[PDB]
Each structure stands twice: as structure tokens, then as C-alpha cells.
Ligand binder design. Structure first.
Ligand SMILES: Cc1n[nH]c2cc(O)ccc12
Ligand SMILES: Cc1n[nH]c2cc(O)ccc12
Lengths: 208, 208
């Protein structure tokens, strides 16, 4: 029922660099995850231009931000293209091996961590705040999967029989104990307004 | 042999806004076209991860910048995924209708033209310097096409029997008479170094 995989060596180093580098500007994780969602929404929209029935699984194109102080999770949900099982395994649809190379040679030439999305690996910036990330996903061409990792070199994949979601991707951030400021309405609002002001899909900040 | 099309009304307004607005920071056209090329190179690279024979049409992943003072053209060539005929017609592979909407509502809320790539329509920033743009393209799944437009509401598409290119996209900028600074080695170098410093594909600036 549960398959366990090793990260390729370069992605493992990336996750370790993100987890271990002292670096105060952690809030960028939210800009990078919203921009990933917006990329995935563009994709299903582009496809729908020539095949309308692609949107049979959900016509609404949006992003929701769901904080939960009980479980200490911040959840980012989008109704984008979603990912097939193969995509989840190939580093959540990214060119993460070459992306990490470029990001590392940029760090060598005086870039800082906030430029991580330039290299196609901004997803891994989740590990600035999250001790565990769970990705639930559904692409039209495949069934619903759950990916999970607490870093340390491996991730799991399983077919997900949780809440049927129609089409898209939920990123569930299980926050580090010292990072619960990102569950605060006010703090989330400020970040979105600061870094994601002109995203072309409605972003709804849920309240508790 | 030559088919002629009308731009959708929103893309037509976008091109007219770009052509007619007084706006001095024109050099951004090069950052936006290099970032489009880099997106297209990511795509063929991602595909090759699961199907290696996708790279049968060219294993090299690069970007070349070719100025020519005789014809007054600056050419951007990439060996990315390239575009099918359908893609050329659907606004060169972009979600240009909704992208223009978002870009326009951003201009209303105090964004400036340099943020155009945030909305998926940075290609049209070519019309800051070019009186005519010619796009030659070859995607693995289709034959080689030429798209052309001098704006004014229409574009052409034809199967291209010019120089067989293997796989990718050439954007040929026929520069406005007052914009030949972009044919200067020194000026091109400065722009690339300023705006495209950390692109993960080698960029070669050709010399004359
Ligand atoms: C990767 C990745 N991070 N966040 C995402 C959201 C998506 O909808 C698809 C992929 C990703
Ligand atoms: C659109 C567009 N502008 N420049 C490009 C280069 C490409 O390789 C593909 C698409 C575009």
C-alpha cells in the first residue's frame, strides 16, 4: 500500500541546505507555493482552451489558504492541473536535479535563498517552516495520490482514499514548533499582500 | 500557402498599449524573451526525463543571441520544446486572454509594464523595440512553422521551408529604426548581465 523512495542525491543536499542554513527571511515559502499553484492553474487553463471537457473535474480556478491551529498545519489548495503518480515521483513535476545545480552555482555567485523559485525548485522552500510536508494530488489522467516527506533523504507515495478532491493539489505544511506565526490571519494576509499581490487567481484566506 | 488570422480583441489592445504608451525602460524585452526560452528548455528537459528519445532532435539545451546590423534584426534562438501550429495560433502557447486581464487590472492597481512576465504575456514586450516579429518554430510532434506580425490586429502562419532547425524556436526582432542600440555587443552584454545573470542554460552572444 505505501511505497518509499530515496530523493536523488542533489535534491537531498538541497533539502539539507534549506533545513540547516541559518536564514531569517522564511516567509518567502508562501510566495513560492502560491506561484507553483498559479503555474498549475495556467496549465489546466491552457489545456481547456482546446479541450473544454478538461474542466469537467472542476470549472473553478482558485487558490485557498487554510490554517489550522489544532493540527498546526497551513494548507495551500489549488484546482490546477494536479500531478500524475509519475510526476509526484519525478520531484513533483520539476527539473529538480538541474534546477538544484543552477541554484547552487547561483549561491556561489552571490544569490540568496529567496531566489530559489528562479531555478524551478521553490517547492522545497516549504522546509523553511515545515517539519513534514504532505501533498495530496489529482490529475485528470490518473487516480488520487498522497506524497509525504519529513526530509532526511526519503519520501513516500500511496494512492489516497481520503477526501476525493476532483482536480488539483493540496500542500499540507506541518509547521515547525517555532513557526506558528504562519497560522496567524494577520501574518498570512501581510505575506500575501507583500509577495503575491498580483496573482491572477482569487486567493481566499480561510479563517478559524 | 499563407493563412492570416486576427488577434483576439484583448491581445490586440495589449499590443496597442505596448506600442503606444510612452515608457523608457525598453530593455526588459530581452529579459522576457530569454525567460520564455528558458521555460521552453525546462519543458523539453522535463519530458526527456521519462522519454530520452525526445532529445533525438538535438541534445544541446542552449540560448543564442544573434544581432545583425545589415538586416537590423536581433535573433533569440533556443533549442527548447518548440511550438506546434495549434500552439502558435493559441497565442504562441500562452493563456494570453486571461493573462492580459490580470496584467490590465495590475496596471490599474499601480504595477508598471516591467511586470508583464508575471502574467504570462512577456513575449508581447518584443513590440517595445520591434516593428515586426517573426517566430520560426519546430516541435517534435509537428512540422516547422513561421509566425509573423507587425501588430495592427493580425498575424500570419505558414509552414516554413527555410533553414531546417531540428527543435526549438527562433524569435527574429526586426528593430524599430530608433532602437538599434540592441544590436550593440556592449549593450546586449550589459542587459543579459543585469537581468538574466542566473539563467540555467548557457547564453551565447554572437559577434559580427
Ligand atoms: C511542486 C509544487 N509545489 N506546489 C505545487 C502546486 C501544484 O498545484 C503543483 C505542483 C506544486
Ligand atoms: C511565447 C514565446 N516567446 N518566446 C518564446 C520562446 C520559446 O521557445 C517558446 C515560446 C516563446
Amino acid at each position: 500500500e505505501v511505497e518509499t523512495f530515496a530523493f536523488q542525491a542533489e535534491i537531498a543536499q538541497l533539502m539539507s541546505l534549506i533545513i540547516n542554513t541559518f536564514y531569517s527571511n522564511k516567509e518567502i515559502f508562501l510566495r513560492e507555493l502560491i506561484s507553483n499553484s498559479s503555474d498549475a492553474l495556467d496549465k489546466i487553463r491552457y489545456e481547456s482552451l482546446t479541450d473544454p471537457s478538461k474542466l469537467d473535474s472542476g470549472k473553478e480556478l482558485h487558490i485557498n489558504l487554510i490554517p489550522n491551529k489544532q493540527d498546526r498545519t497551513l494548507t495551500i489548495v489549488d484546482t490546477g492541473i494536479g500531478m500524475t503518480k509519475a510526476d509526484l515521483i519525478n520531484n513533483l513535476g520539476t527539473i529538480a536535479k538541474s534546477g538544484t545545480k543552477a541554484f547552487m552555482e547561483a549561491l556561489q555567485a552571490g544569490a540568496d535563498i529567496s531566489m530559489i523559485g528562479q531555478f524551478g525548485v521553490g517547492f522545497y522552500s516549504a522546509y523553511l517552516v515545515a517539519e513534514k510536508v504532505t501533498v495530496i494530488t489529482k490529475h485528470n489522467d490518473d487516480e488520487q495520490y498522497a506524497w509525504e516527506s519529513s526530509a532526511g533523504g526519503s519520501f513516500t507515495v500511496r494512492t489516497d482514499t481520503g477526501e476525493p478532491m476532483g482536480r488539483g493539489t493540496k500542500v499540507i505544511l506541518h509547521l515547525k514548533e517555532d513557526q506558528t506565526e504562519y497560522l496567524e490571519e494577520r501574518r498570512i494576509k501581510e505575506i500575501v499582500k507583500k509577495h503575491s499581490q498580483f496573482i491572477g487567481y482569487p486567493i481566499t484566506l480561510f479563517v478559524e
